[PDB]
Amino acid sequence: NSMKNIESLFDYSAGQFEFIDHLLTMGVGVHFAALIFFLVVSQFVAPKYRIATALSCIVMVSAGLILNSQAVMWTDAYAYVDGSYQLQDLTFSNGYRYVNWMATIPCLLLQLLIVLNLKGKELFSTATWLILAAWGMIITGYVGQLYEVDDIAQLMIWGAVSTAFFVVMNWIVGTKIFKNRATMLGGTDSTITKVFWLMMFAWTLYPIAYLVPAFMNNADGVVLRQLLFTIADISSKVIYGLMITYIAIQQSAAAGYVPAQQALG
Numbered sequence: 001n002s003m004k005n006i007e008s009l010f011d012y013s014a015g016q017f018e019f020i021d022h023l024l025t026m027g028v029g030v031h032f033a034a035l036i037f038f039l040v041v042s043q044f045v046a047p048k049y050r051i052a053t054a055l056s057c058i059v060m061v062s063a064g065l066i067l068n069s070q071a072v073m074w075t076d077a078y079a080y081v082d083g084s085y086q087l088q089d090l091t092f093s094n095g096y097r098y099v100n101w102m103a104t105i106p107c108l109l110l111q112l113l114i115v116l117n118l119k120g121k122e123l124f125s126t127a128t129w130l131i132l133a134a135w136g137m138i139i140t141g142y143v144g145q146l147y148e149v150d151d152i153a154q155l156m157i158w159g160a161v162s163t164a165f166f167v168v169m170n171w172i173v174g175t176k177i178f179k180n181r182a183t184m185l186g187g188t189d190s191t192i193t194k195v196f197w198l199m200m201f202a203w204t205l206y207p208i209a210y211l212v213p214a215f216m217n218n219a220d221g222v223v224l225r226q227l228l229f230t231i232a233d234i235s236s237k238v239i240y241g242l243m244i245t246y247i248a249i250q251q252s253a254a255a256g257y258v259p260a261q262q263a264l265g
């Protein structure tokens, strides 16, 4: 895989290399710092919603582990020789992010449906179609990015197929939110709508980063993609998580859960 990604084609300046490393390790720090928040505030969440704030904990450690794995793979593969960082061992590839997305995406979607007050047979059927489209988007994307060096034309077609799964996924999410936000308590019917647009923005940064090999095949493009991945990660995972927690707590309080009522005090 390492030879299939453009990162393997370049020598990096000390600044370039250490900006990538600092990006990944700061991402580890943000995800593990928020995990403690999600854990501590789960006691303020009513029983019917607490799983949502538990799913953020799982998303945090999952993303933190892979990002930490990426950072160590990054510094294992390259060595400073003759004024630049040069590849020594093929041990780095963005493929593991696609495995991070494969597990974290189901979690992110499931916490949304829970705070939407879906239950029963609709919760299981909607989650099933959503996860299935999501995995289809990830797998087709994963196969695409194997060609970002050799076959750009092939990366664009796998991207078009993945985008089809993306669009159908956003349509289900969107429809369920707008048809169910009347069920939301504590005024969260206005908050879930701002979560939907956060999703649209943050999740669209990934396809843009995905196409970096086509409009910026050079070491600077490598740095840009990692930057875009960082902004998208913190947005789609952390900030999104915080808002799902706020909704969880506010609906808990409005539902008669004293810890939520008193925590917001």
Ligand SMILES: CCCCCCCC/C=C\CCCCCCCC(=O)OC[C@H](O)CO
Residues within 6 Å of the ligand: 125, 126, 129, 164, 165, 168, 172, 175
């Ligand atoms: C030979 C090549 C084969 C290429 C073919 C692969 C591409 C299929 C793409 C989209 C399928 C979407 C089908 C539409 C069904 C979606 C299910 C649905 O609508 O569920 C959401 C609903 O809101 C909850 O009940």
Ligand SMILES: CCCCCCCC/C=C\CCCCCCCC(=O)OC[C@H](O)CO
Residues within 6 Å of the ligand: 159, 160, 161, 163, 164, 167, 170, 171, 173, 174, 175, 178, 179
């Ligand atoms: C390979 C490229 C293929 C071509 C791609 C072109 C299609 C893109 C169009 C829309 C994106 C999906 C946007 C989904 C936004 C949410 C929809 C929604 O929420 O529906 C509102 C509902 O109807 C209220 O009651």
Ligand SMILES: CCCCCCCC/C=C\CCCCCCCC(=O)OC[C@H](O)CO
Residues within 6 Å of the ligand: 029, 030, 033, 034, 037, 041, 044, 242, 243, 245, 246, 249, 250, 263, 264
């Ligand atoms: C590098 C450091 C990055 C740190 C990473 C961010 C960690 C979260 C920080 C503040 C939460 C602000 C958002 C609060 C969301 C609302 C929660 C709520 O409803 O209030 C509960 C109250 O905090 C219970 O006493």
Ligand SMILES: *C\C=C(C)/C=C/C=C(C)/C=C/C1=C(C)CCCC1(C)C
Residues within 6 Å of the ligand: 101, 104, 105, 108, 137, 138, 141, 142, 159, 162, 163, 166, 203, 204, 206, 207, 210, 233, 236, 237
């Ligand atoms: C870390 C959390 C999330 C939700 C990551 C989401 C990733 C995507 C929405 C990626 C989408 C892609 C598409 C639409 C087409 C090109 C290949 C990608 C997989 C990057």
Ligand SMILES: CCCCCCCC/C=C\CCCCCCCC(=O)O
Residues within 6 Å of the ligand: 047, 048, 049, 050, 051, 110, 123, 124, 127, 128, 131, 132
């Ligand atoms: C083959 C792919 C099928 C994937 C199936 C996974 C769908 C899971 C759907 C929802 C499971 C319920 C999650 C938590 C319910 C909340 C219960 C509680 O509040 O204690």
Ligand SMILES: CCCCCCCC/C=C\CCCCCCCC(=O)O
Residues within 6 Å of the ligand: 151, 152, 153, 156, 157, 159, 160, 163, 207
């Ligand atoms: C993520 C959305 C994907 C959208 C893809 C757009 C559809 C493809 C558009 C034009 C293809 C351009 C053909 C050029 C062949 C490139 C071969 C090369 O020189 O490397």
